[PDB]
């Protein structure tokens, strides 16, 4: 899944 700071 995506990193804590992605998007």
């Amino acid at each position, epitope marked *: *899944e*995506l*990193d*804590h*700071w*992605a998007s």
Partner: antibody, heavy 132, light 108 residues
Framework: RITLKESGPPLVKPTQTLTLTCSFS??????????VGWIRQPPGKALEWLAI???????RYSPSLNTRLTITKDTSKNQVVLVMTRVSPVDTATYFC????????????????????????WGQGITVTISS | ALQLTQSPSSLSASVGDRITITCRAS??????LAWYRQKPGSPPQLLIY???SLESGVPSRFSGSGSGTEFTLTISTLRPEDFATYYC?????????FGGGTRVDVRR
């Protein structure tokens, strides 16, 4: 100045539980978006990511080790603990904890996320041998 | 999961050379990539964060570029302390993968 240091048993026997402590200074795990992660390095091998925990208490684990890892923090003692259960010989490695910056803020407003893309300060590492 | 492949795995060079190490990801990781240098017996040390930003206190001969799936670290003028192993790390997807490393040793 940020510094981290790992502590725990240098020797552990197969099937046992390994508890590693990362004690740090220079930042608080209550600071905005900060993270502390754990990475290991078997002798002569590559670095392997294990887990990380952030100040808002979100936790993430390596999928390959998920079932054997627990990471937790003790904000008031400035420590992060990683518990690995059921160790076996392949878990012998040098274990490092490391700091991860949170986004830069301006008047308490997040304005730059580029600084979170790295683990910027590392502890010296603690060597753990798993043998009966 | 996501794969990070470093090239070359090993590289020989001499003081004063310009070297470049590359790291390729199996899926795009945007700019969330970091480079480290690790000397024998020591922990890895951060050189470049966010694909190209120079970490504070790190000498200017180190440079990082690229985004997406292909990144490169170049050391413009190799110094003796640079004979070491370099690693790239992706921080876009969990788990936060490391490449296999590239060993830089004294050419002869």
């Amino acid at each position: 100045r940020i510094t981290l240091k790992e502590s725990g048993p240098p020797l552990v026997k197969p099937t046992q539980t390994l508890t590693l402590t990362c004690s740090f200074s220079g930042f608080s795990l209550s600071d905005f978006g900060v993270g502390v992660g754990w990475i290991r390095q078997p002798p002569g091998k590559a670095l392997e990511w294990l887990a990380i925990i952030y100040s808002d208490d979100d936790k993430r684990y390596s999928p390959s080790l998920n079932t054997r890892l627990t990471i937790t923090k003790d904000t008031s003692k400035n420590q992060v603990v990683l518990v690995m259960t059921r160790v076996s010989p392949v878990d012998t490695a040098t274990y490092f904890c490391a700091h991860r910056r949170g986004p830069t803020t301006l008047f308490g407003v997040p304005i730059a996320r580029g600084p979170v893309n790295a683990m910027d300060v590392w502890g010296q590492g603690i060597t753990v041998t798993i043998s009966s | 999961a996501l794969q990070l492949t470093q090239s070359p795995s090993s590289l020989s060079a001499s003081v004063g050379d310009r070297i470049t190490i590359t790291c390729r990801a199996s899926q795009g990781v945007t700019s969330a990539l970091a480079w480290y240098r690790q000397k024998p017996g020591s922990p890895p040390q951060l050189l470049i964060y966010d694909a190209s930003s120079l970490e504070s206190g790190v000498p200017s001969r180190f440079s990082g570029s690229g985004s997406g799936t292909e990144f490169t670290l170049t050391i413009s003028t190799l110094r003796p302390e640079d004979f070491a192993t370099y690693y790239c790390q992706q921080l876009h997807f969990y788990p936060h993968t490391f490449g296999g490393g590239t060993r830089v040793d004294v050419r002869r």
